[PDB]
Amino acid sequence: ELRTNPKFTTDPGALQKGADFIKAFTLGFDLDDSIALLRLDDLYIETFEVKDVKTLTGDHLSRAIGRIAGKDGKTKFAIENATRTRIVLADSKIHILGGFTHIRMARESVVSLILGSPPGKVYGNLRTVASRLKERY
RNA sequence: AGAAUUUGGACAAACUUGGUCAUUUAGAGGAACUAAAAGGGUUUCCGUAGGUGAACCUGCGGAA
């Protein structure tokens, strides 16, 4: 429970930022990863399910979670580093933390992994988006 | 019962020898044909068995 103290609280948004902090820890993000929300003002969490992308069931759903994660989490590790985001893959529930354009690119990468795009095309696209994001022009 | 041994009649192994058939092979010539080679189950927890400072790790079964 969080409550605004009018005699002490001064920022009108503090309640929402504190609540958005608390949810990030709830969703599964590490604490130091959750502190970025309080510290920064342009970090957004993107949340969605595998079923939203495609109605997969049984082993088809399990393979989809595998394709997103990859062996030893390599594919998930690559997506977070290329897009400069933080991803929590809780079964079929995905939570992506980062900047707007950043999580927009991570979302496309995850969806392509769900829908079955070839691994090479995803990895190659991860190379390009990694560089293109950091460039001034 | 077998005889040693003898006369004569057939069966007949094996050997020498002149032929005639079939099969291999030796050199030496004659002549014909062909060939020839540089460059896809991660994260946080729960239960259990084992190890284990039951800290922690591994196997299995569950939840987000």
Curated annotation (Swiss-Prot):
Species of origin: Saccharomyces cerevisiae (strain ATCC 204508 / S288c) (Baker's yeast)
Outcome after substituting residue 66 to D: Temperature-sensitive
Keywords: Cytoplasm, Nucleus, Phosphoprotein, Ribosome biogenesis, RNA-binding
GO molecular function: rRNA primary transcript binding; unfolded protein binding
Similarity section: Belongs to the PNO1 family.
Cellular localization per UniProt: Cytoplasm; Nucleus, Nucleolus
Functional description taken from the UniProt entry: Required for small ribosomal subunit (SSU) synthesis. Has a role in the processing of early nucleolar and late cytoplasmic pre-RNA species. Recruits DIM1 to nucleolar pre-RNAs. Indirectly required for cleavage at the A2 site of the 20S pre-rRNA, forming 18S rRNA, and at A1 and A2 sites of other pre-rRNAs.
Portion of the full sequence shown: 138 to 274 of 274
All residue ranges annotated as the KH domain in the record: 58-110
Protein name in UniProt: Pre-rRNA-processing protein PNO1
Subunit and partners: Component of the small ribosomal subunit, ribosomal RNA processing complex (SSU RRP complex). Interacts with NOB1.
GO CC field: 90S preribosome; cytoplasm; nucleolus; nucleus
GO biological process terms, semicolon-separated: endonucleolytic cleavage in ITS1 to separate SSU-rRNA from 5.8S rRNA and LSU-rRNA from tricistronic rRNA transcript (SSU-rRNA, 5.8S rRNA, LSU-rRNA); endonucleolytic cleavage to generate mature 5'-end of SSU-rRNA from (SSU-rRNA, 5.8S rRNA, LSU-rRNA); proteasome assembly; ribosomal small subunit export from nucleus; ribosome assembly
